Amino acid sequence: ANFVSWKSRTKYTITPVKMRKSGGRDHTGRIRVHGIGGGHKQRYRMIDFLRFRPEETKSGPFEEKVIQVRYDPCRSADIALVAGGSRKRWIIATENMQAGDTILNSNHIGRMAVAAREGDAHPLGALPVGTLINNVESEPGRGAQYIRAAGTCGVLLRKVNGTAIIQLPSKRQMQVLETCVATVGRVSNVDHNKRVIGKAGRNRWLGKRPNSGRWHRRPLPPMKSYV
Amino acid sequence: KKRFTPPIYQPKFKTEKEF
Amino acid sequence: AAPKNRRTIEVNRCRRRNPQKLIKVKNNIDVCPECGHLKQKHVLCAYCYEKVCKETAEIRRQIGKQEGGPFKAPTIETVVLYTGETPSEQDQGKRIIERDRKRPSWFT
RNA sequence: GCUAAACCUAGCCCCAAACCCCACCUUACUACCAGACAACCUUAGCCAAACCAUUUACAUAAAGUAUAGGCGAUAGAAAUUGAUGGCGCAAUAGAUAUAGUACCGCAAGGGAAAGAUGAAAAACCAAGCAUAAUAUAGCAAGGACUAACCCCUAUACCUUCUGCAUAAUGAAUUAACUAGAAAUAACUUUGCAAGGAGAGCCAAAGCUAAGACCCCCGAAACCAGACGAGCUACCUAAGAACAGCUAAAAGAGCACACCCGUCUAUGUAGCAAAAUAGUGGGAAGAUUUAUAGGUAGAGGCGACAAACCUA
RNA sequence: CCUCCGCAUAAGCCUGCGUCAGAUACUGACAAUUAACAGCCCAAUAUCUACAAUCAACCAACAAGUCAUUAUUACCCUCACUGUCAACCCAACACAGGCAUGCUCAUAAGGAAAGGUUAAAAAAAGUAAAAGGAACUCGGCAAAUCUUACCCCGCCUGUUUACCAAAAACAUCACCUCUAGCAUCACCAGUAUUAGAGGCACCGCCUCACUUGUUCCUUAAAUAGGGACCUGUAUGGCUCCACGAGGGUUCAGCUGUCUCUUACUUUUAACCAGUGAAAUUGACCUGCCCGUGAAGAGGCGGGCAUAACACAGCAAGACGAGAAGACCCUAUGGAGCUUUAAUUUAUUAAUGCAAACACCUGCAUUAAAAAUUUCGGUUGGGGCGACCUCGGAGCAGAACCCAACCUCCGAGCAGUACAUGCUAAGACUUCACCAGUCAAAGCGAACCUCAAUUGAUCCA
Ligand SMILES: Nc1nc2c(ncn2[C@@H]2O[C@H](COP(=O)(O)OP(=O)(O)OP(=O)(O)O)[C@@H](O)[C@H]2O)c(=O)[nH]1
Ligand SMILES: [Mg+2]
Ligand SMILES: [Mg+2]
Ligand SMILES: [Mg+2]
Ligand SMILES: [Mg+2]
Ligand SMILES: [Mg+2]
Ligand SMILES: [Mg+2]
Ligand SMILES: [Mg+2]
Ligand SMILES: [Mg+2]
Ligand SMILES: [Mg+2]
Ligand SMILES: [Mg+2]
Ligand SMILES: [Mg+2]
Ligand SMILES: [Mg+2]
Ligand SMILES: [Mg+2]
Ligand SMILES: [Mg+2]
Ligand SMILES: [Mg+2]
Ligand SMILES: [Mg+2]
Ligand SMILES: [Mg+2]
Ligand SMILES: [Mg+2]
Ligand SMILES: [Mg+2]
Ligand SMILES: [Mg+2]
Ligand SMILES: [Mg+2]
Ligand SMILES: [Mg+2]
Ligand SMILES: [Mg+2]
Ligand SMILES: [Mg+2]
Ligand SMILES: [Mg+2]
Ligand SMILES: [Mg+2]
Ligand SMILES: [Mg+2]
Ligand SMILES: [Mg+2]
Ligand SMILES: [Mg+2]
Ligand SMILES: [Mg+2]
Ligand SMILES: [Mg+2]
Ligand SMILES: [Mg+2]
Ligand SMILES: [Mg+2]
Ligand SMILES: [Mg+2]
Ligand SMILES: [Mg+2]
Ligand SMILES: [Mg+2]
Ligand SMILES: [Mg+2]
Ligand SMILES: [Mg+2]
Ligand SMILES: [Mg+2]
Ligand SMILES: [Mg+2]
Ligand SMILES: [Zn+2]
């Protein structure tokens, strides 16, 4: 086939990027995943999951202003246009995140525990034990990859050594270097789980094709460590 | 099963011959 | 239903040369006393009818020229006058169609 | 007497010898802009083994020997030895070929037919019918007869079968074409003869040579490599259509265009290799549809009907 | 008189009813379609581009949506090329089919249902019908009317076997089970409220439903329909709100469905004129009755009948045409599918041991996935059941031999001895072969029972 991934843009931007649906087809043109196809056309909004990304020529903890919170077609959780200095960027909004709020992103691991405020980004080592976190990084600077869906919240259980224990929404436990950053609070759109599709047509709008008509006939896993 | 034999067309020149 | 056997040429001849299928001889043919061409007693002579038809066509072309357009049928009688003929007192008050030829002998 | 009949050479088959201006990879046959992407990779299967599973061939002589082998169907060495055209075809033949053209298929690919004067053109015979339709009754003829029929006798053929007129198969008919290849050992005829044969091989009358000796069409299939998503299944990109009325932000109701195809009738070599007329379902949606692209057969795609993938 | 249309663009085709001249919408020659419409574009490097559309204004949202530049540097000195026709394309055709878009919404544009005649049957379409009104019929199919009340299944809108099944089947919101802690080609530019693989089917209630008989309503009459009670079986069972070309029942109406058919019009039809197929076809000089027979005669036997021919109807026969029957059986013929059928793991995934200092390679083991191949025979057709080899007795009375899914019995050893050693004439023989039997004499020694009581080759 001649499939070329639409994910060719190299420069981050706020503009909605024109996507291209796959229909569950691999680059070879064959179906690799079933049930994907069609649906409303969508535009991707590049999300900056590295909440502590100091602006060029700038460094250290910095604050940003929330301009608006907007529905994201490509994500269960709604996003927020957060702007600081002379740049803007899309981020994952938290439950109680309103336009005009101030969001602090820091890399400082103080001797004490920072007073957690929903929506701000701090290194996991600086959070009080038991705070609800989201957008957690596996490695320092990797970027948020866990607890990114609507209403999902991880729990900071322990801070033994220079490591932090995180209970993921699936209740699995994760050891991450305390330097890795996470955002306080739970992801937005908490009532996503209580959404009733109502009609098969709405699933088709969302882009899920009907299931095949063919008829067919535990202990919590060990902690996952990254140290 | 359904048994269908496609029709066979004769070559055109035989019927297109002219004096 | 399809033929059970090929019908022989003998049977086919018996069928297709039967007196019914043969063309019957016509005994109503006669000679037209006017032109001498053959005609059937009950049918008009083809030659004489063609004469009349061609003369009628010429007269009708003249009528069309005189009328000059559709929906111009006259409300008065018509008289055909040939070269060397003058309208009669009876023909007075009737539209005259002038033919550029002598009066035919058969036409009176 | 019409359809027609014939015809001889266009060429071809097997051998020998000999080694063989411009345009065009983009939508080919398109004058004229920053490339980068470049190829090697065991054949398999049919078939034989009466299945099938290991297995099954791809000069002479030694020799069908040594060997291999569900030691079986079968496979099978080496050392060593020395190594100038036609009892062809002649237009249904011979090349498919007048031509890879016409035509058929999206494509790969399949693939024809045929012509005949003469030194000069600047000179009777197949079938089918017609001449000429037919006379009671009969496998159509035979015995006959003065006499065609009338009289008497007579259950087409081939194949298959225990047995066929069989109401079992095939055949309208004419022309042309269309189907028994061969070893061992025997038999007959010669030559020579304890030897025969023009190395090898055989031999307790053998040996050399010759003569004679074994068909055609037909599957559903299997495998390899190509070609196919202009139909259809689904998907991708960017588009388009959806009157009017009721209701009101509706996978809402009635109902056009449009899409579909419930039921009936017609049609069934049809207008049509799935249609027409009426009737009917949907008809702002999970809708319909134009365009280009993609998924290719140990596969694809599938709201699974074993659906559809060029009838 | 018709108007489905029509005119353009797209796509497709490629000169395919323009003129002239010839033949017997064909052939040859000649001419033609003129760009403004459309196609054919863009100098770089970075850098911008949150705020739909819907009369965009209120409102209303969810499915979250086609439309935007700047900074610097280069740069004008030049209007080519290509489509332009048509009655047209895809369907073998002047094919009643398919064919996107804009306007016209019945047309200003485009067209002709009847070759002529007659008005037979049968056939198709339509109109009308006395009285009756489903009595027709499997069924109110069709037609005429606009018409109630139910039951079964499916929640619903939708999807499906293109070309015999549109459905109760598939999907479906909802609910439930399982798997997965993660990024640069799907999933996904996503991250457990996510994604994938599934089951079932909205919601609601629970964790009673179906079978044995008796009965009630409905009809004059009911194997139909509906409702009760009565006996036993069997966290996925009850509940029909709405909806349905789904399957049954029904009031009323309606009507040619029918009692019971008739009349007319059109097509068809018949005759005249032109053009002109298809299956089929052994030859036919091609009758009826009875009998015969390869088990149902036009052809044979005995009777009867019998001048020759067309034309129009009919469908009782020609075991009529059509498809080398789809049913059934067979073939050591196929293929699809399923497996706890046989043989494998070549391929992946795991591990373990080597090799190297995780990856790769070699070797093993375990799974998934598959791959190749097979699916015996007899048989009162096949299946089921039974049987498959060997011996005794009847059938088969007397040399031998004789079938049976025929009648009855039995065997797959046991026991005793260790010359139950070796050899060797001649014979028998289960109708072939294989195999199986008896045995004189001799050497050497002493001084085999039993009917069956078993099995080749190869290979170990
Ligand atoms: N067997 C056979 N002999 C041939 C063939 N062609 C040619 N010859 C023979 O070749 C010889 C010479 O042929 P020619 O044509 O007379 O002479 P050429 O042209 O000198 O011959 P080439 O050198 O062979 O071309 C004659 O003996 C021919 O018969 C062929 O095809 N087969
Ligand atoms: Mg299912
Ligand atoms: Mg075999
Ligand atoms: Mg054989
Ligand atoms: Mg050698
Ligand atoms: Mg030839
Ligand atoms: Mg003749
Ligand atoms: Mg016969
Ligand atoms: Mg037969
Ligand atoms: Mg026949
Ligand atoms: Mg397509
Ligand atoms: Mg509308
Ligand atoms: Mg609707
Ligand atoms: Mg099924
Ligand atoms: Mg099935
Ligand atoms: Mg066709
Ligand atoms: Mg007409
Ligand atoms: Mg007529
Ligand atoms: Mg009436
Ligand atoms: Mg009744
Ligand atoms: Mg009633
Ligand atoms: Mg009745
Ligand atoms: Mg009806
Ligand atoms: Mg339904
Ligand atoms: Mg429906
Ligand atoms: Mg579908
Ligand atoms: Mg069907
Ligand atoms: Mg369909
Ligand atoms: Mg149907
Ligand atoms: Mg279902
Ligand atoms: Mg009834
Ligand atoms: Mg005629
Ligand atoms: Mg009889
Ligand atoms: Mg007749
Ligand atoms: Mg008839
Ligand atoms: Mg007969
Ligand atoms: Mg028949
Ligand atoms: Mg047969
Ligand atoms: Mg069968
Ligand atoms: Mg077999
Ligand atoms: Mg014997
Ligand atoms: Zn006359």
Author numbering:
A (entry chain D): 61 to 277, 287 to 296
B (entry chain d): 38 to 56
C (entry chain 0): 79 to 186
Task: Give the authors' words.
The human mitochondrial ribosome (mitoribosome) synthesizes 13 essential subunits of the oxidative phosphorylation (OXPHOS) system. The mitoribosome is composed of a small and a large ribosomal subunit (mtSSU and mtLSU, respectively), which each contain a ribosomal RNA (12S, 16S rRNA) and a number of mitoribosomal proteins (MRPs). In human mitochondria, the GTPases GTPBP5, GTPBP6, GTPBP7, and GTPBP10 mediate mtLSU maturation, as their deletion results in a loss of active mitoribosomes and stalls mtLSU biogenesis at distinct states.
In addition, classification yielded a 2.6 Å reconstruction that lacks MTERF4-NSUN4 and GTPBP5 but shows a new density that corresponds to GTPBP6 in close proximity to the L12 stalk, which allowed us to build a molecular model. GTPBP6 contains a N-terminal nucleotide-binding domain (NTD), a PTC-binding linker domain, a GTPase domain and a C-terminal domain (CTD). Like GTPBP5, it binds above the PTC and primarily interacts with rRNA. The GTPase domain is located next to the NTD, on top of h89, and shows clear density for a bound GTP molecule, suggesting that GTP hydrolysis is not required for GTPBP6 binding. The PTC-binding loop of GTPBP6 occupies the same position as loop 1 of GTPBP5, between the P loop/h80 and the PTC loop and in vicinity to uL16m (residues 134–143), and causes rearrangements in the elements. Binding of GTPBP6 also leads to movement of A3089 by replacing its interaction with F92 in GTPBP5 by a stacking interaction with Y241 in GTPBP6. Collectively, these rearrangements lead to a nearly mature PTC conformation.
